[PDB]
Design a protein around this nucleic acid. Structure first.
Lengths: 454, 454
RNA sequence: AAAA
């Protein structure tokens, strides 16, 4: 269930041209046909604006004719039968306009000095919110129920093109555009660029930034596959020396680092900090050279066809420099606490703030394993447990409650004979939220300042 | 540090108009100058695609001398100054165009048939990947170091406009477009449009979808503020009846639901399930009328300039219907297990899988509190603990491994002097991923099935 | 609305 979405434009200027995507040249005056036969979708839909044509009965019927009224020039038959197929639906538009009125079922023609040619009407000055048009297009898209979404662009106002792109973006649409200026001419060869990646590359960079910001490892889009298929043909010494470094950027380490944080592996997450500090330092001076090459693109037409390269994918990976600090593994964990607080991952933040003072004390008592067999641990954990339990009574409750979550001796639900579990305690969203985000840091520093003189 | 950016086009055709931005007016011909005089940015970076210059001297300065040669045609004197210090950064382009040759600095003009014009030898044809142009624009944006990013898409090819939008999207730019489309004429009036709304509305819907997909409330963009401020001055009662329902959609419940799932409060998360069943069922209808309203936008011209209502923000909230199941609170939790497995939130999945069979057995006993005082719990927890520790030795280990976390008696790290920590057990990143995602479900059913026998 |  493939379906082609076609943004409309002024047909009274369209010159004949031949298109080229994966070879298979087809020629006409508009993309809609060239792309129809190329992809062979189940149903093509025409997205026409209000500021384009206007008549007493079917403005919708005027477009179906106006496109054949232009297909008639050069006796172009492969259009009359293609118009029985495409469904024409009207969309709103913004701005001053030169429209084209219809007397009835055919476009009207005004013989004013030049000769019998189409007429103009400018009183359309519609003040609309872009979100309104977006909503109107979103509805027409949603009310189609397609498996695959393919949207021909190239035509339409720069505003509606921008709007339609964002609507399509939601329906995981494949975007195509035939870039051609004025006076293209007969038998001209025009590529039909696929912008899908450019879109699902901008999204990736926002997901990569969110992945860092909220310490997640499922928001990060692993571009190691794109980087794996690199090393393109015509390569100059200086570009290949930089690119071969970039090609081998250990991105899977940054993923593992975020994983060991989301799943709470500070021991390994904090240890990796120094390695990543070297990864990003190299990724900075690599991207700086790439930024230079792309800032002088006129000399790097080998990167000409690079669909497997994205500066935004790399620059967004640079954000991890924030999640990195310097110092001993203990000092690095102290920072990791604050990262668990800024990202609202409470469960890990409390657990870390609970066990860090054990480790702090172990360091000042000569150090010792986190095993119950170790006496320097055993006693040292009792110092932090007992100090916490008589002072920060809340730190202990909040930690344990979040650790076992639902169905625990901490929450005491009744379960019921019927099976309708009924909770025992409440502890609202903004109970935990206030504690972690406002006191958990202040309280921690007060604990460590106590264990300092230990 | 505000700075404007604009996809530059064919200035040779550009006609004078009177631009309108929420009160302030401006009388300029080309788009950029109107916004420059308005927002008064610190910088104005530009330069066209390579598809309109090929002069022997500076390809850049040529645009500087032709833009002003169009300013001289009309009655003007103040577009050579304050516009002289504009940053001209050249960009690549795709397809077939007609690129104005240009002499040493100013353009090269010739006459064929007509009295005088600028000779169109203009043979532009370049095969480029859209990602290349995106990279080239990205580098220009990054190498500007602006505080605020402002971007024009009033002009340019539909391809470069799409590209520039995605590049701007990352610098969280404010997007503006002056929709004209044709023959504005002398003293033309054009009320500009801000598309910034549409962009950070498409992003919001993708964030809302992943918020659901990965059970994380942090990704959800709370539109209750937009809905709070939804007070159109004049709207029809039918329109009124639907929107006044939508206005009061309590979205904060869906947020709280996701917060409980993310923090492990399955008790309260599972109970809210049918309240939410009712919430989405209500938004499944009106959404239906909103999508019928917007599919026949010509009727409800009242939301003509309503930049507050959004359909994608609501439709993406309907995704939560997946997270919802019907049945007793026990079998709702059984589903919640699979939701903790599908989203790779392991820690909660195992804790739920370990503690669910305690509740299952309690129901078989007629129900009991999950308090250590309760004998029906005490013994019944020992049945599940002993059965687990005797067969699913792995379930118990992994569960404490995700519960206590790195710094723990479960990981046994060393920590010596100078704050250095060395792990005791290597993290089994894939041993967790494979166990939870392949065995935990099968294992759970084998325990519950055994419990069902007694 | 094939660089308004």
């Amino acid at each position: 269930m493939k379906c082609l979405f076609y943004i409309a434009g002024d047909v009274s200027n369209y010159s004949i041209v031949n298109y080229e995507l994966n070879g298979q040249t087809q020629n006409t005056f508009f993309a809609a046909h060239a792309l129809y036969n190329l992809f062979k979708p189940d149903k093509v839909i025409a997205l026409i604006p209000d500021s384009l044509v206007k008549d007493n009965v079917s403005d919708e019927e005027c477009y179906k004719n106006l496109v054949i009224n232009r297909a008639k020039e050069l006796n172009f038959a492969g259009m009359e039968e293609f118009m029985n197929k495409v469904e024409i639906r009207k969309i709103p538009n913004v701005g001053i306009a030169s429209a084209i009125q219809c007397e009835n079922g055919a476009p009207k023609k005004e013989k004013n000095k030049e000769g019998r040619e189409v007429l103009k009407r400018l009183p359309y000055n519609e003040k609309r919110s872009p979100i309104f048009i977006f909503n109107a297009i979103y509805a027409i898209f949603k009310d189609e129920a397609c498996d695959e979404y393919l949207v021909d662009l190239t035509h339409g106002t720069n505003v509606l093109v921008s709007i339609g792109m964002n609507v399509g973006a939601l329906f995981n649409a494949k975007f195509y555009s035939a870039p051609v200026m004025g006076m293209p001419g007969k038998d001209s060869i025009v590529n039909i660029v696929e912008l899908t990646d450019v879109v699902q590359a901008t999204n990736d960079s926002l997901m990569i930034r969110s992945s860092i910001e909220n310490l997640d490892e499922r928001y990060f889009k692993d571009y190691s596959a794109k980087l794996s298929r690199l090393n393109p043909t015509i390569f100059e010494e200086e570009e290949k020396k930089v690119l071969t470094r970039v090609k081998g950027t250990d991105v899977n380490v940054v993923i593992n680092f975020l994983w060991n944080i989301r799943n709470g592996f500070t021991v390994n997450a904090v240890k990796s900090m120094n390695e990543l500090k070297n990864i990003i330092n190299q990724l900075e001076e690599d991207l700086e050279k790439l930024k230079s090459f792309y800032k002088n693109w006129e000399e790097h037409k080998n990167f000409q066809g690079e669909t497997l390269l994205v500066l935004s994918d790399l620059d967004s990976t640079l954000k991890v420099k924030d999640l990195l600090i310097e110092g001993n593994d203990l000092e690095k964990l102290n920072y990791l606490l604050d990262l668990y607080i800024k990202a609202s991952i409470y469960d890990k933040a409390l657990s870390l703030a609970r066990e860090l003072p054990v480790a702090i004390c172990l360091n000042k008592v000569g150090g010792g394993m986190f095993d119950d067999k170790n006496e320097k641990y055993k006693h040292c954990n009792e110092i932090v447990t007992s100090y916490l339990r008589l002072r920060y009574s809340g730190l202990m409750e909040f930690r344990n409650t979040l650790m076992h979550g639902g169905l625990s001796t901490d929450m005491k639900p009744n379960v019921d004979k019927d099976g309708n579990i009924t909770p025992g305690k409440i502890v609202t969203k903004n109970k935990i939220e206030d504690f972690v985000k406002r006191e958990l840091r202040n309280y921690f520093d007060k604990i460590v300042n106590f264990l300092s003189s230990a």
